[PDB]
Design a binder for this molecule. Structure first.
Ligand code: JZX
Length: 841
């Protein structure tokens, strides 16, 4: 190993936030093997990407322009304003024109072919054989009434992304020797026993238990648990799952290892505890806290895996089963039917989840048939990719390598635009794989290595988990380290900049929190210190300029200490504001950023990403709802950063305006506020139209997700009329449609108007459009719960969204169902809003 090979690794370590060379917390070599595993996939992707297209990372889409953005072009001409230090001619361009082509009507329009269109003030480029209509920046401008400003500069040097050079028919059994903990005490001395489970996709194949013994600091069984399953019948991916009840602790051991060997010998496993179902319960990882943790002691002494058409009436049984939602439970009868008509089931892609849930993975012979089933995958391969279908196959119910592989195979066809919409959930999905090295992991790896925008967000999603998940940090760590070793020194440098900045600011964030009371107001002394610490940082600490983690196009510069401050909550976040490092920016506006420790922002990351998905759906059907899913990113334990949405105010503060009489409200302030922050009437109406759409979209999306019952506090509006929700960390009312909201639309307690009809129509249109993807939202929503909450109910909590999306009904009953929910809100009015407060005291 080189002397500067080890300075590389230690560089990596500090980016990663966890040291993958460490081997204190392993009982085998799976991770190191996975580090060696991923060297090929990486060096193939790095070896195959186009240096030029890679360096500029054009953000791009095949989807058609939606209806509602073509109406912003009633002339088949788009305006691009090219710049050059001072001057700038506005060039007239057809939606189908290529970057190279509109340089051909720029240079030819004057009277050297190696310049490039770069977005003014961002690290964004308009390049490669793509029609300008198909660039996200362009579409972004069209959606906002913004104009397309572009600067004529040089392509950046690919050299900046140089990657460096790297370097039996016996029944299974298991002796349970005993357990041992240093300190247990609670109050009374209860009994205790161990429960071993052979598991495969949350599915217990077999289960034994010890006699109970009294819970002393060391309990010793010296007992064989003979299982019914046989060695050969054990399927790759099967977890020996040891648990301790008196349910206190758990730990898992793969029974077949990353080399197909049968796990044999002595193991002393350090167990996880339960904070008194979710994805943590599955992890192959042991508890690294060897000093406080409970530990179980086992021994394994036990290589392997070495015509007729249907009578049209059962077909209708099948087809009804196939027609049911992912959280519909399959009865035994269902499964015997599905399985017996394998080859008929195979002709329906949507059937696969339900079909492979009907495999008996506890028998070599049936699995061997399941493998033969998959061998003829001609209907699947040719099928159109369905994301929700494909996801279902990657959740916690499917531990089979090949079942899982076929889903990954379908993802291959996603373009980056789409990978980006699902990346976070695809990352969380890695928690569901049995082995560290998996098709899914090599895919994520490969797609972020292929495109810097995905790479960037891969990083932060991986690092979010590493920083706070004992259960999955080691695995992610290995995946991340795989990536860093091929993202190229350009970005290695950019990530280092970002890690430093956020490390500095979290120090300041947490340091400030101590200084103020747990809850009351703003100490002048705290505003005094904050201003010093940031003046301290600004000089000989803070990197000249960093990329904004949630918006890597934007390079932040120096702070605006004058504008930075501590917020007026109970956790004490930092309103921070930054100059923009790019001097070609068209504007003077600041990069706003909030920094917060106290809420688990991972939840907020996830909910925001759904919102983003919902918008991509409404994009398919020519709908625009003006959701404002702001940037939000986790960085560590109960901590991270949030995008500041310029010009937004709290609806609550709009009622605190005068008095806010501990919980009084007044209807017309919201419309009155809008008039004030509108110069014309023209811009005021444009607000009411936006408030109508935003109000609609947040009403629908929030209702679907169960998070619709919120306070005015956690809801904001921009000056330009765009309502939005904040703060998704964990009588009743479905969504906020308070009498103030209805007033802006032009109504007050049981009446109708030209704009209220518009709201109703949109919600309905919008609501319906989500239901077209019912399956997708359900699988997301359920994955969400499992990988991103405390503990939860694998049926009940999920069940809500099923009821919500009004599963199994017809468009009219839905139209009706939601139109009832509206009517609930106009009946309650303030009664719930006013309630928060009543409980404070
Ligand atoms: C007087 S003061 O100290 O200067 N300050 C003025 C602003 N006011 C209200 C706000 C609260 C709030 N909370 C969150 C938030 C978001 C997520 C989360 N998990 N937790 C909290 N996000 C906010 N957005 C983010 C979007 O862009 C605008 C700012 C806002 S604005 C408080 C007092």
């Amino acid at each position: 190993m080189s002397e500067e090979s080890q300075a590389f690794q230690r560089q990596l370590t500090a980016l990663i936030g966890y040291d993958v060379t460490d081997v204190s917390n392993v009982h085998d070599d799976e991770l190191e093997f996975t580090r060696r595993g991923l060297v090929t996939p990486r060096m193939a992707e790095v070896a195959s990407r186009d240096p030029k297209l890679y360096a500029m990372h054009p953000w791009v889409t095949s989807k058609p322009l939606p209806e509602y953005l073509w109406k912003k072009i009633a002339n088949n001409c788009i305006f691009i304003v090219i710049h050059r230090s001072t001057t700038s001619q506005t060039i007239k361009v057809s939606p189908d024109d290529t970057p190279g082509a509109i340089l051909q009507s720029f240079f030819t329009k004057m009277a050297e072919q190696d310049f490039v269109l770069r977005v003014c003030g961002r690290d964004e480029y308009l390049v490669g054989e793509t029609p300008i209509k198909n660039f996200q920046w362009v579409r972004h401008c069209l959606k906002n009434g913004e104009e397309i400003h572009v600067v004529l500069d040089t392509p950046p040097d690919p050299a900046l992304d140089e990657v460096r050079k790297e370097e039996c028919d016996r029944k299974f059994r298991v002796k349970i020797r005993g357990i041992d903990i240093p300190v247990l005490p609670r109050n009374t001395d209860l009994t205790v026993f161990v429960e071993a489970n052979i598991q495969h996709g949350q599915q217990v194949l077999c289960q034994r238990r010890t006699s109970p013994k009294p819970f002393t600091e060391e309990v010793l069984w010296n007992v064989w648990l003979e299982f019914s399953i046989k060695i050969k019948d054990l399927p790759k991916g099967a977890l020996l799952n040891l648990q301790i009840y008196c349910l206190l602790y758990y730990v898992n051991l793969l029974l077949i290892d990353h080399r197909f060997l049968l796990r044999r010998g002595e193991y002393v496993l350090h167990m996880w505890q339960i904070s008194g179902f979710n994805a943590d319960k599955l992890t192959s990882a042991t508890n690294p806290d060897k000093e406080n943790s409970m530990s179980i002691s086992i021994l394994l002494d036990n290589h392997p895996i070495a015509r007729a058409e249907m009578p049209n009436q059962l077909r209708k049984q099948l087809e009804a089963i196939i027609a049911t939602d992912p959280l519909n439970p399959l009865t035994a009868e269902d499964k015997e039917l599905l399985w017996h008509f394998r080859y008929e089931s195979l002709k329906h892609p949507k059937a696969y989840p339900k079909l492979f849930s009907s495999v008996k993975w506890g028998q070599q012979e049936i699995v061997a048939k399941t493998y033969q089933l998959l061998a003829r995958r001609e209907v699947w391969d040719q099928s159109a990719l369905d994301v929700g279908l494909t996801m279902q196959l990657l959740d916690c119910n499917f531990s089979d390598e090949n079942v899982r592989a076929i889903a990954v195979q379908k993802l291959e066809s996603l373009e980056d635009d789409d990978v980006l919409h699902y990346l976070l959930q695809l990352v969380q999905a890695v928690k569901f794989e049995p082995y560290h090295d998996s098709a899914l992991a090599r895919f994520l790896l490969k797609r972020g290595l292929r495109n810097k925008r995905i790479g960037h967000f891969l990083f932060w999603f991986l690092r979010s988990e590493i920083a706070q998940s004992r259960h999955y940090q080691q695995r992610f760590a290995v995946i991340l380290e795989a990536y860093l070793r091929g993202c190229g020194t350009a970005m290695l440098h950019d990530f280092t900049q970002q890690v430093q900045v956020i490390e500095m600011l979290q120090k300041v964030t947490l340091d400030i929190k101590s200084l103020s009371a747990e809850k009351y107001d703003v100490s002048s002394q705290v505003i005094s210190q904050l201003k010093q610490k940031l003046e301290n940082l600004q000089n000989s600490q803070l990197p000249e300029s960093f990329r904004v983690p949630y918006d890597p196009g934007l390079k932040a510069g120096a702070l605006a200490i004058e504008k930075c401050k501590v917020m007026a909550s109970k956790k004490k976040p930092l309103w921070l504001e930054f100059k923009c490092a790019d001097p070609t920016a068209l504007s003077n506006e600041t990069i706003g950023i909030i920094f917060k420790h106290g809420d688990d922002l991972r939840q907020d990351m996830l909910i925001l990403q759904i919102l983003r998905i919902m918008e991509s759906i409404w994009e398919t059907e020519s709908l625009d709802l003006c959701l404002l899913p702001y940037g939000c990113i986790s960085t560590g334990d109960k901590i991270g950063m949030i995008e500041i949405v310029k010009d937004a105010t709290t609806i609550a503060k709009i009622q605190q305006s005068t008095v806010g009489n501990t919980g009084a409200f007044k209807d017309e302030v919201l419309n009155h506020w809008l008039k004030e922050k509108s110069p014309t009437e023209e811009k005021f109406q444009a607000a009411v139209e936006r408030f109508v759409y935003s109000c609609a979209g947040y009403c629908v999306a929030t209702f679907v997700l169960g998070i619709g019952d919120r306070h005015n506090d956690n809801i904001m509006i921009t000056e330009t009329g765009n309502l939005f929700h904040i703060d998704f960390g964990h009588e009743r009312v479905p969504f906020v449609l308070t009498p103030d909201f209805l007033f802006v639309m032009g109504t007050s307690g049981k009446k109708t108007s030209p704009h209220f009809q518009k709201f109703q129509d949109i919600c309905v249109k919008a609501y319906l459009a989500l239901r077209h993807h019912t399956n997708l939202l359900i699988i997301l929503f359920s994955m969400m719960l499992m990988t991103g909450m405390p503990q939860l109910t694998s049926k009940e909590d999920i069940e809500y969204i099923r009821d919500a999306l009004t599963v199994g009904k017809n468009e009219e009953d839905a139209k009706k169902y939601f139109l009832d929910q509206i009517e609930v809100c106009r009946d309650k009015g303030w009664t719930v809003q006013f309630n928060w407060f009543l409980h404070l005291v």
